[PDB]
Amino acid sequence: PDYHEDIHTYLREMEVKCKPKVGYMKKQPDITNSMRAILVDWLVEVGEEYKLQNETLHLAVNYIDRFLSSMSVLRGKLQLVGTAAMLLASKFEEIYPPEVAEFVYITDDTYTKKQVLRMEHLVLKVLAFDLAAPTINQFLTQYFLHQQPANCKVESLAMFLGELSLIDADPYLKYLPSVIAAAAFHLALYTVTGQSWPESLVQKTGYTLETLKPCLLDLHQTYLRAPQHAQQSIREKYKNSKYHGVSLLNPPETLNV
Amino acid sequence: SMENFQKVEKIGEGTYGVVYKARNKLTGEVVALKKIRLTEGVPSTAIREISLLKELNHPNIVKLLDVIHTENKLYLVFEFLHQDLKKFMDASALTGIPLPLIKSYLFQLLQGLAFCHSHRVLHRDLKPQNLLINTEGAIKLADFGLARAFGVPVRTYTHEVVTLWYRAPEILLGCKYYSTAVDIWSLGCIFAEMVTRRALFPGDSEIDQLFRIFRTLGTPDEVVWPGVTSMPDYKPSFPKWARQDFSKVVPPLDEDGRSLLSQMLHYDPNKRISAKAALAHPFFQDVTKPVPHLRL
Ligand SMILES: Nc1n[nH]c(N)c1/N=N/c1ccc(O)cc1
């Protein structure tokens, strides 16, 4: 708690600086939201295969969105971008990152090692080496400390919801990681325990149910529609006992905000 | 671009390349150039060192000025500092580092570290060799190759961290979690070393390092450090040394100095003083900024 407020304050500054351009997809000639969902869902599978941290997945997605915010990319190269992003995220975040050989392997030899490493370099150049970006995950773990008391199901369900938001650029590109985390945390808390966004988090974050509402109504729909979404890797992942099988919990019919 | 730099000489060597002193031909600025040669692509250590140094602008952190990004090579451009604290202490033999300079250096080190921690970075390799000093009385944290961005609360991170002599007890005992306190332990050891000009805990192995610590500060029990006896590499067979009169650990140290050192070497990482809080310690009440004369 010595640095908890300083760090939170600093992450609130950095997330604004690391934010992708909300409208970049309409500026993309060849790729679409659906193609991006397919990529992100595949990254979830890659994270599962190699048992990577959730943070690593969140970082890779941040890098991809920032990259696509200024670089036009043909659909045949979208996976190369995602692959180099996941490699960078792993190098940054993981104790034992997978080897390049492994990232080359999971693209089904769609690309060569040389291509992957050249893309790694280009991603680094385009992001100005600014890889230490705040994620939904980093805000959630802070918010979790305000539980009374802590509840594993709430924590896993908030992680699950925050992860679902990575899939759909529309609508989640328009929300900051701290806001999505607040929506995910309130939604999870309310689903499991019936409780709401705690007063202590209003003091910490300045966010209220009112300011969270737009993100929250988006996230509630996403939660309700999750069983029918084209992409299912995250639901499959959160069946694991590692996450207390929270994807099997029923979403609430209404939120009453 | 590299064309504007004239290489003066080699000055160091890392694990992925060498450090050169160079000068900017156009502006005159003297710099250090860390060259990182590029089959796993850009090394993870360089990815962390660069991303984190870019965000860490502070008078007491070595300044990354630029990154030069060719196909086969990565050049990190730093402000040049003249000498490291280790070389300085060796050259200060029979003179000692005067207390006002020790105090100023520690105060500066603590500001640089508080800034790292406030920005969610662990350094993880604080030792005299990685602390650089200039001809103006400054000292700065350098080599962030082993650093990492942490989260709140922390996850389990890499176990193989911190040069052994400077390595905190919660790392040696295999704790699932460590955080900012590990860097304060290191600075504590360095504070003591500036005073005595010898390493405080010069162990040759992990168990030797633990025993040296125990013999100086007492073998920790549940009273001094709740939870210690259940830690993964704690052993009930550990000899049980009494804690030393702390004035004997660093004899030349005054009352305020001993108080501060003892809080930096507190066993429980939870109770170990933060860099931030340490800045207000009465030890620093009369701190100034002496300018030592470097031999080179
Ligand atoms: N020897 C030196 N004089 N001035 C420097 N900046 C310098 N080296 N600084 C560094 C900085 C970063 C690093 O990983 C290794 C050395």
List keywords for this structure.
heterodimer, A: 257 residues, mainly alpha, Cyclin A, domain 1, 2 domains, globular, B: alpha+beta, Transferase(Phosphotransferase), domain 1, five-stranded antiparallel beta sheet, binds 4-[(E)-(3,5-diamino-1H-pyrazol-4-yl)diazenyl]phenol
Characterise this structure:
The complex is a heterodimer of chains A (257) and B (296). With 257 residues, chain A is mainly α. In chain A, helix 7 packs across helix 10 (177-193). In chain A, 45% of the residues are buried. Chain A folds into 2 domains: 6-19 and 133-257, Cyclin-like (Cyclin A, domain 1), CATH 1.10.472; 20-132, Cyclin-like (Cyclin A, domain 1), CATH 1.10.472. Chain A contains 13 helices and no strands. Chain B folds into 2 domains: 1-82, Phosphorylase Kinase, domain 1 (2-Layer Sandwich), CATH 3.30.200.20; 83-293, Orthogonal Bundle (Transferase(Phosphotransferase), domain 1), CATH 1.10.510. With 296 residues, chain B is of the alpha+beta class. In chain B, helix 3 (99-118) runs antiparallel to helix 5 (181-196). Chain B has helices at 44-55, 85-91, 99-118, 169-172, 181-196, 206-217, 255-264, 275-278; strands spanning 5-13, 18-24, 30-37, 64-69, 73-79, 83-84, 121-122, 131-133, 139-141, 148-149. Chain B has 8 helices and 10 strands. In chain B, strand 8 and strand 9 (139-141) form a beta hairpin. A 5-stranded antiparallel beta sheet of chain B has the order 1-2-3-5-4, with helices on one face. In chain B, strands 6-8-9 form a 3-stranded antiparallel beta sheet. Chain B has a two-stranded antiparallel ribbon with strand order 7-10. The radius of gyration of chain B is 20 Å and the shape is globular. The interface between A and B is medium-sized, with 36 and 31 residues. 4-[(E)-(3,5-diamino-1H-pyrazol-4-yl)diazenyl]phenol (F18) is lined by residues 11-12, 19, 32, 34, 49, 62, 78-81, 132, 142-143, 145 of chain B. Chain B: The modification N6-acetyllysine is found at residue 7. Chain B: One of its GO terms (biological process) is G1/S transition of mitotic cell cycle.
